[PDB]
Amino acid sequence: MTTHGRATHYSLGQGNTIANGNCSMPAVPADRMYVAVSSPEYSGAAACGTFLDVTGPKGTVRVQVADQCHGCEVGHLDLSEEAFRALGDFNAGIIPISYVTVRDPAGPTVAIRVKEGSSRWWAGLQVLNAGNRIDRVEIQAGRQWLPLTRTDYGYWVTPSPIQDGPLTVKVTDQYGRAVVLPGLRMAPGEIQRTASRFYPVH
Template identity: 40%
Template structure:
């Protein structure tokens, strides 16, 4: 079952607390600090030290189960599942604190192959287990199996319709910037933003797939630069301070001219996903060729 990333249950019995107090009584300050750091990391559901989303040409072998997220956008906080309902949840080491959100995997099972978007964190999945949507699982295995042996790999520069999307989180304001980037295809490396005045500031990735800047960057409109793990970069302008609405752009992060990438022609701007909301403004985007691919994490 897929569940939000969270802390493991702790043994907090009186006996355990007594043992801990007794042990700490004879410990030095450095040891105490180390113990407290470990405890905070466990309780906070920290991302594993070597966590990284699937990327490049690496083929992973493992098992796949299936689940139904309903109308939810999963731990990636998307407005909802993709229209084709082909999505996947990854374990902590590959979900990587939301770094995998919005990227795509090609999964092959006994019956065939399917392309799925990373939308969720699977709390019960280890390094070799993935949790597919029911619709995706039935394309690669018989549902009666429950669990199937699979291989999967990242889809590099997946063809997508339309350009980048931006969605400001509820509560975002001139004093606290929080944006979600969508329709990017490859795992994102960084997001930088600036307001009508001042320079770019680097945003911090959060586990719910929002990028935040404490203190805010003013009332907008905003200019946002997005860089993926392979070095592709795009800069969008004209993003308004409107929360909970999808603001669409017209140019993909990965240019159609980029080798191994063949995105569909950009779709025209469309309204927010909320039927009652006013149409979101269209941003101007410049797609740039970037540096070498992002390397493996150092452990």
């Protein structure tokens, strides 16, 4: 589904090592290709981590959805300066664009970052590199599953305490595909990379 609209530009700059953009990314992407999307498209942070292929005057660039543009209408992207320069003249100010959300974008394996401050009492998890929208995130409780609550800042939080010991996390994407991630540690701040993927490399 192609959206027709416009792009302006902004910058998160260097960023920090904790939370970048409303999506609270661990880092500004190294290629500096990212975007802030309108509140409806941000969709309570459900758009976080997804990718847009944006077509402008000079060609097409892929950007990671990393932020919310509160003042943007639907169809109006706030591109990183770097993405904007790739599509148009930097001094243009605003450029016409068309864009689509990328299905199953190439990328690394799934990772989980436990939010700083997390404990058995209350914890937050961020899912990295799912590629598409995440429908739900669950933590194992015995042989049941405790469902997490999607925050509007890129994490999933516990509605009630979790069990001690290694965490097993189940992540189901918008297309019903699930990954189960065993052996995760209560390691706040750490990016815990796994072997799991929702779809293959090729």
